[PDB]
């Protein structure tokens, strides 16, 4: 259903749902909320699952917020030292600008 909601070009319903299944635990699923979005709040939770400031940085940096991820990372006694490619490079783009719909509701006919 969530998928239907993201298919369609509108934003909330998925988010409450996201709340209500985030709230029902998770280790690989948060992902669903993030892409079609920019911003995620999941990160507040996420760090707790990870909490190695690593995820928090990778995620963090672009809202102009790499920084908190570093603060903890330091506090720990950091453990990061090498990284692989991953520089945001894939397009979270597509959906439905004016003319030629969405489909909340879909019309048809027996004919």
């Amino acid at each position: 259903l969530s998928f239907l909601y993201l298919i369609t070009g509108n934003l909330e319903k998925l988010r409450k749902m996201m709340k209500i299944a985030e709230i029902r635990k998770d280790m690989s699923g948060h992902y669903q909320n993030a892409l079609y979005l920019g911003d995620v709040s999941e990160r507040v939770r996420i760090l707790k699952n990870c909490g190695q400031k690593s995820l928090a940085y990778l995620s963090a940096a672009t809202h102009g917020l790499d920084e908190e991820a570093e603060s903890l990372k330091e506090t720990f006694d950091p453990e990061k030292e090498t990284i692989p490619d991953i520089d945001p490079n894939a397009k979270l783009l597509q959906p439905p600008a004016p003319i030629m719909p969405l489909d909340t509701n879909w019309p048809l006919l027996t004919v």
């Binding site: 369609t8 453990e79 090498t82 945001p88 783009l93 959906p95 600008a97 030629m100 969405l102």
Partner: protein, 239 residues
């Protein structure tokens, strides 16, 4: 004193004693004696000469090694390499978690290739999307027989495949006759497609967009570029 003896011990001996050494907790030293690929390997896990462990791996000769190792590498946060091993493993799932977290297209192409590999429909889609590629998502659907669903995407974010696709879906339906089951129209009648005139296509927004895809949305960030995708987005998008 022992060292003089040491020449005068070989293969297997080294192993036993190595275990003793290991018991001594003279792991490094235990490493020096080290004498079985397994033996070396486990110790290596404990030990973490990372590169060194790789050489022992050499050609690992078991993804299981890589899997085990991957967890370890990741712990050491020796990712550049980890990626190489994991990639070498091509063990997609864990590897995805990293790759995604910083984000990356390149990973995505190779992966796309992978995506094709995996054998359940769903992941591959996220990828296609993730990349931004309706086209890919839709092509994927063609193989799986996702047909109702494919239509929704084709509609929402318009590649107007809704017209193309709908005919085919309908055809299936058609096969399974009954007029209601057949179901029919694209520009006008049942559907009024382009005559409805509403929210998944056009040039101007699109032009702005054309660029948009190219820059980073911005708010304040890192070398790891911007795109956003929230309230603002909705507003311009309408424009």
């Amino acid at each position: 004193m022992a060292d003089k003896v040491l020449p005068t011990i070989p293969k297997e001996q080294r192993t036993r004693v190595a275990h003793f050494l290991e018991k001594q907790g003279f792991k490094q030293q235990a490493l020096t004696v080290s004498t079985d690929p397994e033996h070396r390997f486990e110790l290596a896990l404990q030990l973490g000469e990372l590169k060194i462990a790789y050489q022992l791996a050499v050609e690992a000769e078991s993804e299981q090694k890589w899997k085990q190792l991957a967890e370890l590498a990741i712990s050491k946060c020796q990712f550049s390499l980890a990626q190489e091993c994991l990639h070498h493993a091509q063990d997609y799932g864990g590897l995805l978690l990293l790759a995604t977290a910083s984000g990356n297209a390149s990973m995505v192409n190779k992966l796309a290739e992978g995506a094709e590999r995996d054998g359940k429909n769903n992941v591959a889609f996220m990828s296609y999307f993730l990349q931004g590629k309706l086209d890919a998502c839709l092509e994927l659907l063609i193989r799986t027989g996702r047909l109702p669903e494919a239509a929704f995407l084709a509609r929402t974010y318009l590649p107007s495949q809704v017209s193309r696709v709908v005919k085919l879906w309908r055809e299936n339906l058609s096969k399974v006759n009954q007029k209601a089951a057949e179901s029919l129209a694209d520009p006008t009648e049942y559907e009024n497609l382009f005559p409805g005139l509403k929210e998944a296509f056009v040039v101007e927004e699109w032009v702005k967009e054309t660029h948009a895809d190219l820059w980073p949305a911005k708010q304040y960030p890192l070398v790891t570029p911007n795109e956003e995708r929230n309230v603002m987005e909705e507003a311009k998008g309408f424009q």
